[PDB]
Paper text:
The C-protein C.Esp1396I is a member of a large class of helix-turn-helix proteins that act as transcriptional regulators of gene expression in both prokaryotic and eukaryotic systems. C.Esp1396I finely regulates a bacterial restriction-modification system, providing a delay in endonuclease expression via a concentration-dependent ‘on’ and ‘off’ switch. The C-protein–DNA operator complex consists of two ‘controller’ C-protein dimers (chains A and B, chains C and D) bound to a 35 bp DNA operator sequence (chains E and F). The dsDNA is distorted in the complex, due to binding of protein dimers to each operator site, resulting in minor groove compression (leading to a 50° bend at each binding site) and large major groove expansion at the DNA sequence centre.
Numbering used by the authors:
A (entry chain C), C (entry chain B): 2 to 78
B (entry chain D), D (entry chain A): 2 to 77
DNA sequence: ATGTGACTTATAGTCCGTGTGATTATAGTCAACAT
DNA sequence: ATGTTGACTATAATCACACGGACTATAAGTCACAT
């Protein structure tokens, strides 16, 4: 569907595994539904900047380093 | 409101201006509503990635250039 | 399958709803997985007395009270 | 160990005796292993409901009578 | 008769994830009138 | 030109649940040898 979305959803998962988190921890720490974290990674889903922020806080990661990894993923072949 | 959401909006407005675009024209170029655009720039909207993407295409700016800028703006 | 199991299964759910609990709450307080609580109610799984005991403690109900409702459900038409 | 588990077992042993059965015979009647039964009666086993059901069949006691008894036993 | 121990094998119970209908909050989109 | 106020309607986001596969702990079932 959307170019950027699958990149965002890819990076959320990448970080989540890097930090040895599971989906449902992240769902807690991000103060969003269990199934939403799944749905974001699983398919992609069209999240909101506010929701993205919540997830970033949950990944225990800064806006900045998130976007830095976002850029790197976009740039790949 | 949100810090990120504010910086996003600021960035959208910044790029629109360094390109000498009007809102009217930013909305024409991305096929969204001008009041919608207005709203974002006065930070009254919490856009989705999809919408953000349409706005980048309307600004004629790559995702990467946008985020490069968004990062810099984020750091005061 | 087993006669007693689906009865035990039924009564666990009945109580759980009577107390306005959700599976999530229950598996919570029973310190079992929410998958297992679902599994039990769903497909009448074959639990252990120890696990049943945990569920009773989770339902905030006593041995006695449970077995009294168990007897009732068995007796029904 | 568990409180319930001990009284299940106690009950199983109680009924086997009130009937005049040996373990050997409770095992035969319920098509289970004798050491299996001995284990339960010394309370070294944590039955599943299914197993309990087989032991009730062997004792020839309905679920209801078993639980009526277990309750009474439970209340000291 | 019953009670051990110790040793496989079935399965109970765990852990992480997928996929889904139904409801609620809210973004997406477009009016009217402002300046 | 841009701002703001309501609106309607799509959909983001929530909530309670089912379902699967893979792995770990342990109950199920059977030996040998006590007594
Ligand atoms: Mg719009
Ligand atoms: Mg056995």
């Amino acid at each position: 569907e959307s170019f950027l979305l699958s990149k965002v959803s890819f990076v959320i998962k990448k970080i989540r595994l890097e930090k040895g988190m599971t989906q449902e921890d992240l769902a807690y720490k991000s103060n969003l539904d269990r199934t939403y974290i799944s749905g974001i990674e699983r398919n992609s889903r069209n999240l909101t900047i506010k929701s993205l922020e919540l997830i970033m806080k949950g990944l225990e990661v800064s806006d900045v380093v998130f976007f830095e990894m976002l850029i790197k993923e976009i740039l790949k072949h």
